[PDB]
Amino acid sequence: DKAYTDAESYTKGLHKIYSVWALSGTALLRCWWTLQEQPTDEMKNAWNDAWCTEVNYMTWTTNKVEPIEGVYQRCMYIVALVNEFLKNIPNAPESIDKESYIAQARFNRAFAYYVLMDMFALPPFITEKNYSIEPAPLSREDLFNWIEAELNEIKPNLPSPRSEYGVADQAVASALLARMYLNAEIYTGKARYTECINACNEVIKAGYQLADNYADLFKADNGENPDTKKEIIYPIIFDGDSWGMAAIIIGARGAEDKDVLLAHSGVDQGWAGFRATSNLVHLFDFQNDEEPKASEIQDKRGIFYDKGRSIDITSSVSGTFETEGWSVFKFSNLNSNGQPGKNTLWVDTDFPMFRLGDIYLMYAEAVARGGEGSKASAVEYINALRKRAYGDDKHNISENWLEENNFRNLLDERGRELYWEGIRRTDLVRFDLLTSGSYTWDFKGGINTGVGVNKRYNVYPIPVTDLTVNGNLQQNEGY
């Protein structure tokens, strides 16, 4: 698209690569987030589009589904850009730090392949070294192995942790490895819980801290507030001075008066799409658990708007945004001082792709499942999260809690801590509860009370779009 020539062009080329996550151009962050939340127990979408039902229910086929196309095209676009960048970078002028730029381009490509591996399993494998009109996929395990070797090799050449908010630093590479290793039994058939713990410790030792205020993690000024910057390892950056994060926020608001929307959210518009299931609400403690009300919640992590809404989605998932399912206002374009962000549409709120709260929970789960690490520390990390949640010391857990009921307390706690941060689908797959009939939620499988679905649905199908033009590429099993 833009040829490489002077120093500026190489710096702008790297920035274009990083920018694909935030870019509309639909948007990678939105598509990815949708695909990680909408088929789960965390979110159901009230839009009437045929794709929404399919994704809501997990009844999709190989018929084209717009967010599936989005995630796939945009990830492979990142890979394309990085490959062209790496091909040009040896000709860079002397003023460019080639070693740093190569390490960072490679991080972006590794992350794009991570998302593809987790979501599609078997993408085409195309690097700057194996150019082909019709590239073949690796096995999922081989792709994992390649991504891991990319991240291990580049890590000592990446910037030091926190040296620039938004840049893929050494700790960002370790956070991605932690997330890969936690899930390695899914991707590779072999568990890597010790390696998960090792990557978590690399992050923990870099001096990150939990934000004092949980809610501010997801407000307009999360990227500028020092309290929340202590915790955010890797953000997808947004600023009012692209519709990706705007769509996630606005999508979760209803058709209310502009002023009431601005009052409570810092936005003009509410598209009446994304909202909660009963399962998400019931994960949190309330003053009266038999009759939950958003204003009586005890675990303050749950940030809900309940006016006029039932807890359950019962009659229909579409057309019922205003009446069935609580709204989720976790991501907000009000700043931490209550003021609106500087634009009513183009939000300031950053997406926290990796943050220390997740690292804590990963460390605890990896130790629970038998990795080499400390149960005492695991308990300390979960209790830090729960003290923040409840504002007191009366909701601590103990070591037995980590292992009991087949690690389900950890799945529940990742729900309470990390809901709507784009990780729920991966976590459900790890517990093999995404597709199973043993754990159901509102409209799972297309039945209101919920049913299991076939195990093919643990991954999305590769676009027929790409299968038509690439003869070496194969569809995922079962589709």
**What is the token pair recorded at 80?**
């394309």
| Stretch near Mg ion under the rule CB under 5 A, chosen from 167-175, 201-209, 343-351, 378-386 | 343-351
348 binds Mg ion (CB under 5 A): yes
Residue 217 or 283: which CB sits closer to Mg ion?
A: 217
- Binding site: which residues? 224, 238, 348, 350
Among 350, 417, 421, 427, binds Mg ion (CB under 5 A): 350
| Closer Cβ to Mg ion, 45 or 349, answer by number | 349
Q: How far apart are CA 463 and CA 68, in angstroms?
A: 8
Tokens of 431: 């517990």
Interrupted backbone of the chain, residues before each interruption (C–N > 2.5 Å): 25, 241
CB nearer to Mg ion: pick between 232 and 411 = 232
Q: How far is the CB of 458 from Mg ion (least distance, A)?
A: 34
Relative to beta strand 44-45, strand 274-275 is: antiparallel
Q: Helix 7-19 crosses helix 98-120 at what angle (to 10 degrees)?
A: 20
Whole-angstrom Cα distance, residue 88 to residue 176?
A: 26
Q: Exposure string (b/e) for 21-56, b if CB count within 10 Å is 16 or more?
A: bbbeebbbbbbbbbbbbbbbbbbbbbbeeebbbbbb
Contact status: 223 vs Mg ion (CB under 5 A): yes
Q: Find the part of the chain contacting Mg ion (CB under 5 A) among 120-128, 207-215, 218-226, 276-284.
A: 218-226
Instruction: Name the token pair of 392.
Output: 């007191």
Q: Nearest approach, Cβ of 15 to Mg ion (angstroms)?
A: 16
- Expressed in angstroms, the distance from the first to the final Cα of the chain is 35
Which residues, other chains included, contact 449 with Cβ-Cβ below 8 Å and sequence gap of 6+? 440
Q: How far is the CB of 352 from Mg ion (least distance, A)?
A: 11
Q: To the nearest whole angstrom, how small is the minimum distance from the Cβ of residue 158 to Mg ion?
A: 22
Contact stretch for Mg ion (CB under 5 A) within 80-88, 269-277, 340-348, 391-399:
340-348
3-state secondary structure of 165: coil
Between 77 and 165, whose beta carbon lies closer to Mg ion?
165
Site string for Mg ion, 241-260 (x = CB under 5 A): --------------------
Alpha-carbon distance of 167 to 88, in angstroms, equals 21
For the bound state, the minimum distance from the C-beta of residue 341 to Mg ion, rounded and expressed in Å, comes to 8
Q: Assess 216 for contact with Mg ion (CB under 5 A).
A: no
Please, are residues 128 and 138 in contact by the beta-carbon 8 Å criterion?
A: no
Nearer to Mg ion, 330 or 444 (CB): 330
Query: How many Å apart are CA 427 and CA 187, to the nearest integer?
Result: 12
Joined tokens for residue 275? 């909202």
Give whole-number Cα distances, 214 to 126, 284, 302, in Å: 40, 15, 10
CB of 48 to Mg ion, least distance (A): 32
Residues 379-418 that bind Mg ion (CB under 5 A): none
With contacts defined by CB under 5 A, name the span among 95-103, 348-356, 379-387, 394-402 that binds Mg ion.
348-356
Give the dihedral sign, CA 142/198/418/290: positive
Candidate segments 123-131, 169-177, 222-230, 417-425, binder of Mg ion by CB under 5 A? 222-230
Residue 225 · residue 336 · CB < 8 Å: yes
Q: Which CB sits closer to Mg ion, 223 or 452?
A: 223
Q: Cα–Cα distance between 249 and 331 in angstroms, integer? A: 6
Paired tokens of 226: 């020092």
Under the criterion CB under 5 A, does residue 238 sit at the interface with Mg ion? Answer: yes
- Cβ 184 to Mg ion, closest distance in Å? 33
Identity at 446, one-letter amino acid code: G
Q: How many CA atoms lie within 13 A of 355 on its CB side?
A: 28
Type and span of the H or E element at 274: strand 274-275
Total binding residues for Mg ion by CB under 5 A? 5
Residue selected from 42, 216, 239, 442 as contacting Mg ion according to rule CB under 5 A: 239
C-beta closer to Mg ion: residue 238 or 329: 238
The stretch among 100-108, 120-128, 217-225, 325-333 that binds Mg ion (CB under 5 A) is 217-225
Binding residue numbers for Mg(2+)? 224, 238, 348, 350
Least separation in angstroms between CB 138 and Mg ion:
36
State which residue, 249 or 367, has the beta carbon closest to Mg ion. Answer: 249
The stretch near Mg ion (CB under 5 A) out of 177-185, 332-340, 344-352, 412-420 is 344-352
Closer residue to Mg ion (CB): 125 or 243: 243
Binding site for Mg ion (CB under 5 A): 223, 238-239, 348, 350
